[PDB]
Amino acid sequence: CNTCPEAWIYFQKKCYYFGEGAKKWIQARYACENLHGRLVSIHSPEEQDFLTKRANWRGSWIGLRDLDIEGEFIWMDNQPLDYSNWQPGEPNDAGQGENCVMMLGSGKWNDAFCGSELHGWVCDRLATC
Numbered sequence: 003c004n005t006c007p008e009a010w011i012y013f014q015k016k017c018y019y020f021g022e023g024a025k026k027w028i029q030a031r032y033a034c035e036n037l038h039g040r041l042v043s044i045h046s047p048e049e050q051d052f053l054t055k056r057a058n059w060r061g062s063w064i065g066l067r068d069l070d071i072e073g074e075f076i077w078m079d080n081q082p083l084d085y086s087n088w089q090p091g092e093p094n095d096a097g098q099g100e101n102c103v104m105m106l107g108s109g110k111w112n113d114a115f116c117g118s119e120l121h122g123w124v125c126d127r128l129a130t131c
């Protein structure tokens with residue numbers, strides 16, 4: 003039906019917001035909430051393909067994190083871990099600990115320090131049709 007709030011993009015019964023501007027993961031979380039969505043949750047290769055094609059080449063935050071329990075990733079939509087697109091070797095919990103997930107410019111996922119500033123962040127919301 004291709005029906006979304008203004009500035010959002012429709013794909014398979016969800017609307018997506020391709021946010022831009024440097025944000026830490028928590029700032030991106032609340033930026034999405036301010037727009038009445040959440041950082042994006044990804045549950046199929048077709049959805050990943052939609053995002054990969056449109057992703058910010060400098061990287062972008064998504065709605066996946068292991069902040070609560072290390073190695074237990076949780077989606078913003080709280081749905082199961084039924085699809086992954088990890089960059090090879092990721093998540094690697096590098097450095098002091100990497101608990102927030104980004105898409106690299108390629109769309110592949112990397113865990114990163116939650117306080118890194120990325121210039122992209124993607125929100126989603128349920129579409130009305």
Ligand SMILES: CC(=O)N[C@H]1[C@H](O[C@H]2[C@@H](O)[C@H](O)[C@@H](CO)O[C@@H]2O)O[C@H](CO)[C@@H](O)[C@@H]1O
Nearest residue numbers: 060061092094096100106112113114115118
């Ligand atoms: C290559 C890459 O993923 N670069 C991003 C960087 O990633 C960290 C770390 O998380 C990766 O596991 C290793 C893989 O070699 O590389 C870097 O050390 O995280 C940054 C955010 O903190 C991103 O801006 C980079 O794109």
Ligand SMILES: [Ca+2]
Nearest residue numbers: 068095100101
């Ligand atoms: Ca971690």
Ligand SMILES: [Ca+2]
Nearest residue numbers: 094096112113
């Ligand atoms: Ca990593």
